[PDB]
Design a protein around this ligand. Structure first.
Ligand SMILES: [Mg+2]
Ligand SMILES: [Mg+2]
Ligand SMILES: [Mg+2]
Ligand SMILES: [Mg+2]
Ligand SMILES: [Mg+2]
Ligand SMILES: [Mg+2]
Ligand SMILES: [Mg+2]
Ligand SMILES: [Mg+2]
Ligand SMILES: [Mg+2]
Ligand SMILES: [Mg+2]
Ligand SMILES: [Mg+2]
Ligand SMILES: [Mg+2]
Ligand SMILES: [Mg+2]
Ligand SMILES: [Mg+2]
Ligand SMILES: [Mg+2]
Ligand SMILES: [Mg+2]
Ligand SMILES: [Mg+2]
Ligand SMILES: [Mg+2]
Ligand SMILES: [Mg+2]
Ligand SMILES: [Mg+2]
Ligand SMILES: [Mg+2]
Ligand SMILES: [Mg+2]
Ligand SMILES: [Mg+2]
Ligand SMILES: [Mg+2]
Ligand SMILES: [Mg+2]
Ligand SMILES: [Zn+2]
Lengths: 57, 155, 62, 69, 50, 102
RNA sequence: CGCCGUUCCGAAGGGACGGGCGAUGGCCUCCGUUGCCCUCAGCCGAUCGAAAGGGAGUCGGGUUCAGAUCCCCGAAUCCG
RNA sequence: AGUUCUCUUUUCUUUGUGAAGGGCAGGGCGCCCUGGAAUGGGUUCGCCCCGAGAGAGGGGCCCGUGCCUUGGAAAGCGUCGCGGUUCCGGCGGCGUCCGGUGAGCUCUCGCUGGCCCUUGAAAAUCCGGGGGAGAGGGUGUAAAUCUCGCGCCGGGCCGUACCCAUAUCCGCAGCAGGUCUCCAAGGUGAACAGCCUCUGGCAUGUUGGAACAAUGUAGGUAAGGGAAGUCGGCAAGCCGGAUCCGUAACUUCGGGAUAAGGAUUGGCUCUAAGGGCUGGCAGCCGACUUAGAACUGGUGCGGACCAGGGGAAUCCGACUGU
C-alpha cells in the first residue's frame, strides 16, 4: 500500500504538524496539514461550563 | 553500454521501481543514447522500455482456507494460541448482548407490547444477567403478559 | 504496448548464444532527411550539367 | 470558483470590466459557460441545449470567447 | 544541514572555490617552484571544523 | 433484460487457421450456467453464429470476460496463443488479432 | 580589567481622542501637514532567548540530468 | 496479463478528484419553548440524569476532514489505435462501474470516567461585550458612517542540492559501536512475536579457486547409567501455547498461583446456539465465534515457529527503584 511522507521539514509529531489524508485528482494519497481546532467563547460569568452559541469556533 | 541513467529515468517516467523497468536487451545501443526523459518517453511508446507486471501473490490459498474456517475447520483445541478472552473478549460479548436486549425492550415498549413499568423492571433484570439471549427474554415477556392478563380478567 | 513483447524480446536475445562475436546491434533495421523529391531535384541540377553541355556542343556540331 | 444560477446574473458578470474571457464547455448533459473574472471563475450550467445557443449570441461583443474541446 | 546561515553559506562557498588544482601555466613561470596545490581539501578525509 | 456479446475471428478464419463452427461447438458444451455446461441453462443462453462473428445472448446475467476466458482457453487448446491475441473492440465485442511481430 | 543586581536607593511617558492659539502649502472651494499651549495617560521595566512550543494565509496537474506546495498551467487565499 | 497435459465463469494488476465557496448527511450541545413526573421514570459497555423541571413533543446552535455541486474533465490514470522532425503537455475510441462487511489496523473528531500530599507555561497576537464622551442631515443633490458584495495596488531579506547511516554524521577508516523522528501490505497467530510472501530494495557486507587433516569457533545427535563430573548442575537439557479439571504449607487475607498434579489438542463430514432490516409471523440479508457428535490416519496432531522445569528449606534486604 502507498506509504506517506511529510511535505515539510518538521519530521516530528508536534501539535503544529498534524495532517489528514487526501486523495487527489491524480489518484494518490497525500498529506494535507490541518488547522488547529478553534474554540467558541467561554461565558464571561465564570460559572457556566458550556461555551456560547451563535459564535464561530 | 552502461544503462544506469536510463534505468533510473525509465523508473521515474513509469512511476514504478527500477526492478520493474525492462530494457530491451537487443536494443541497448538505441537505449544507451536516450539521455533525457523526452527520449525515454519515446522509447516507452516505441516498446524498447516496458513496465513488467507485478509478481503474483495469489490470495486463493487463504480464501479457500477462510471458507473452511467459516465451516468450523482448523478451529479446534489444537489450533488455538490466545486465550478465550483474547480470541473473543468478554466485554465485547457483554456489550453486544446488552445492546441487543435493550434494543428489543425499547421496541416492545414503543410497540406497546409492554408498558413503561414492565420495561423498567425488565431493563434492570437485563442488566442483572437474568436473560442469556434474545429468545429467553422474549419467552419471559410472553409469560408475564399471560399472567398479567389473567389477573386483569379476575380483577 | 503488448506486454507479450517482453517475452518475445527476452527469448530472442537468449538466441544470441549462437552468434557471439557478430550479434546485430539493432533489430529494428528500419531515413534520408534529404527528401527524395528534393534529392531528385538536386540530381537534375548537377548530373545533367555535364550531359547537357555535351548535347549543346552536339547541337553546335551540326 | 462561484456558480451562477440565473442567466441574467451571468450576463451581468460577463459585462464586468474585469471579465477576461468566456469559455464554452459542452458535455453530454449540460453546456457550461465559464467567465474568468478577477477573483472567481463564474460558471453557468445550462441543461437546455437550445438556451445555450440563445445565450451564446447574447454575450458581450468585446469579451473574448473560447469554445473548449 | 539544509538549514543554513548566510554567514556559514558564505564561508563554505569560499572553501569551495579554493579547492581546485593550480593552473598549468603557473608551471612555466620564470621562478616558479609550485608543483601542485598543497592545500587541497577532501570533504571526507579532513573536516572544516565549522 | 437481454445481454448480447460477439466474438470476431475474421482475421484468423480468413487465413484458414481456425474454424468458427468448431468454436461454436466448443462454446456450446462449455459455457456454464449456474456451473452447468451441458444445456446452456435450458436455452436461457442462446448461441448464434454468423459467417465470421459468433454471437452469444442471455436472458440472465452473463460476463463478457467469461467469453474471453473461454476464447483464450480454446486458443490454447489449438496452440494459437503465441500468434492470436484477444482484444476488446467495443463494449460488446472481442476480436482476435496478430501480435505485431516482423 | 570590572562584578552584583533586573525593579531593586530612578525626574524611567517623547505618546494621544479632543480643544485653543499661529505658520505653511494643495484636487487653494476648505482641507491636510506642521509649531506651541491646554487636556488625557499605570504598566513597573532596555534587550536577547525555540528551523520540535505560540504564530494569518496554497492547493491540483505538468515539467529537469540534477530544483520544485518555489518553475509553467489552472484554481485560490492572508496581510498591508 | 498469467495458467490451461487435466481442472479452474479462474488467478494477478487496475478501476481519481485538491484548496476555497455553496448545499446536504452525520456527530455533539451543561441551548430554548409547552408541560408537569411515585405504581418513579429515562439511560450507558460503565455510568449517570430529573420539581434547581424527568420522560414526550417542537425548535435553536457548533463542527461537518463525510457526500453532492462549482472547481472538473479540458486534467490524471487504464487500455486499444493512429501520426510527426519523429526529444510533440501530439491526436483519436472506449473505460474510470455497482454493492457488502468488521472488538480489524492507522489517523482523527467527540462523549464520559479514573489518578494526583503530582493539578500539568508565558507572551506576542486577535476578538466580543459594558458604557456613551461625540459625530452626522434636516426631508434631500441627503449626510456621518458600514466588520456587506465586487473592483484596484503591493508583499522586500536569508535558507532550499544531496546523504541522513552495516559507505556522505562522531568514533584516526567505506570501523559489527554510537546517533532524534514520520508512513507502514497479505498469510499464520492473542499479537508492531517468530516464519513465509507482495510493493520497494539488495548482491552476502574490504577478494576468489580447490580441498574436507588435526586443533578450534558455532550448531546437533548418542546405546546403558543418570551428577558418579566439578568448588558449585557451570553448561546443556527438561517444562512451555490453549481448553477442561485440580491446587497445599504459610499469609500482612491482597496473595502464594501458570502452586503442585492430570487430561485433551490433527484432518474431514455434520448438528445446535449466539443477530440485523422490511412488512409470538413471513421474507430477505450477515459476522465471526462456542459447544457437541460421527468418521478417519502406523497414537500423529500448540507437528515448523512461538513458548515458565518443579518442590522443601536456611541467610540477607520488606517491596518497585538506583
Ligand atoms: Mg513552530
Ligand atoms: Mg473530497
Ligand atoms: Mg452570530
Ligand atoms: Mg470483566
Ligand atoms: Mg567522518
Ligand atoms: Mg527575539
Ligand atoms: Mg519558531
Ligand atoms: Mg503562486
Ligand atoms: Mg426532555
Ligand atoms: Mg478522461
Ligand atoms: Mg452600546
Ligand atoms: Mg530538497
Ligand atoms: Mg556468506
Ligand atoms: Mg561477493
Ligand atoms: Mg561495508
Ligand atoms: Mg568481514
Ligand atoms: Mg546417553
Ligand atoms: Mg536412552
Ligand atoms: Mg560429587
Ligand atoms: Mg571428584
Ligand atoms: Mg544454568
Ligand atoms: Mg511455591
Ligand atoms: Mg531463623
Ligand atoms: Mg532489595
Ligand atoms: Mg543516578
Ligand atoms: Zn453563565
Amino acid at each position: 500500500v502507498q506509504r506517506l511522507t511529510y511535505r515539510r521539514r518538521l519530521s516530528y509529531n508536534t501539535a503544529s504538524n498534524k495532517t489528514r489524508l487526501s486523495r487527489t485528482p491524480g489518484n494518490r494519497i497525500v498529506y494535507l496539514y490541518t488547522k488547529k481546532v478553534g474554540k467558541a467563547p467561554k461565558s464571561a460569568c465564570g460559572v457556566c461550563p458550556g461555551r456560547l452559541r451563535g459564535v464561530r469556533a | 553500454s552502461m544503462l544506469r541513467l536510463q534505468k533510473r529515468l525509465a523508473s521515474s517516467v513509469l512511476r514504478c521501481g527500477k526492478k520493474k523497468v525492462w530494457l530491451d536487451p537487443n536494443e541497448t545501443n538505441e537505449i544507451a543514447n536516450a539521455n533525457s526523459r523526452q527520449q525515454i518517453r519515446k522509447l516507452i511508446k516505441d516498446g524498447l522500455i516496458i513496465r513488467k507486471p507485478v509478481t503474483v501473490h495469489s490470495r486463493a490459498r487463504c480464501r479457500k482456507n477462510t471458507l473452511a474456517r467459516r465451516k468450523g475447520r482448523h478451529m479446534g483445541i489444537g489450533k488455538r494460541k490466545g486465550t478465550a478472552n483474547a480470541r473473543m473478549p468478554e466485554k465485547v460479548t457483554w456489550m453486544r448482548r446488552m445492546r441487543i436486549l435493550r434494543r428489543l425492550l425499547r421496541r416492545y415498549r414503543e410497540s406497546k407490547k409492554i408498558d413503561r413499568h414492565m420495561y423498567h423492571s425488565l431493563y434492570l433484570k437485563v442488566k442483572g444477567n437474568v436473560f442469556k439471549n434474545k429468545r429467553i427474554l422474549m419467552e419471559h415477556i410472553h409469560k408475564l403478559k399471560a399472567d398479567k392478563a389473567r389477573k386483569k380478567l379476575l380483577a | 504496448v503488448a506486454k507479450q513483447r517482453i517475452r518475445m524480446a527476452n527469448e530472442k536475445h537468449s538466441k544470441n548464444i549462437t552468434q557471439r562475436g557478430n550479434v546485430a546491434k539493432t533489430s529494428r533495421n528500419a531515413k534520408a532527411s534529404v527528401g527524395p523529391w528534393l534529392l531528385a531535384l538536386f540530381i537534375f541540377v548537377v548530373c545533367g550539367s555535364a550531359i547537357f553541355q555535351i548535347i549543346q556542343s552536339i547541337r553546335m556540331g551540326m | 470558483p462561484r456558480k451562477i444560477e440565473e442567466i441574467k446574473d451571468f450576463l451581468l458578470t460577463a459585462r464586468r470590466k474585469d471579465a477576461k474571457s468566456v469559455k464554452i464547455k459542452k458535455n453530454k448533459d449540460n453546456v457550461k459557460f465559464k467567465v474568468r473574472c478577477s477573483r472567481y471563475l463564474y460558471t453557468l450550467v445550462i441543461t437546455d441545449k437550445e438556451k445555450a445557443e440563445k445565450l451564446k449570441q447574447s454575450l458581450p461583443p468585446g469579451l473574448a470567447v473560447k469554445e473548449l474541446k | 544541514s539544509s538549514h543554513k546561515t548566510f554567514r556559514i553559506k558564505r564561508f563554505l562557498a569560499k572553501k569551495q572555490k579554493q579547492n581546485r588544482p593550480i593552473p598549468q601555466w603557473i608551471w612555466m613561470k620564470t621562478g616558479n617552484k609550485i608543483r601542485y596545490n598543497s592545500k587541497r581539501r577532501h570533504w571526507r578525509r579532513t573536516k572544516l571544523g565549522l | 433484460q437481454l445481454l448480447k456479446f460477439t466474438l470476431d475471428c475474421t482475421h484468423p478464419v480468413e487465413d484458414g487457421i481456425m474454424d468458427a463452427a468448431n468454436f461454436e461447438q466448443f462454446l456450446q458444451e462449455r459455457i456454464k450456467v449456474n456451473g452447468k455446461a451441458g444445456n446452456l441453462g435450458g436455452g436461457v443462453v442462446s448461441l448464434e453464429r454468423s459467417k465470421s462473428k459468433i454471437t452469444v445472448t442471455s436472458e440472465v446475467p452473463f460476463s463478457k470476460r467469461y467469453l474471453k476466458y473461454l476464447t483464450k482457453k480454446y486458443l490454447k487448446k489449438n496452440n494459437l496463443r503465441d500468434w492470436l491475441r484477444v482484444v476488446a473492440n467495443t463494449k460488446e465485442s472481442y476480436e482476435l488479432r496478430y501480435f505485431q511481430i516482423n
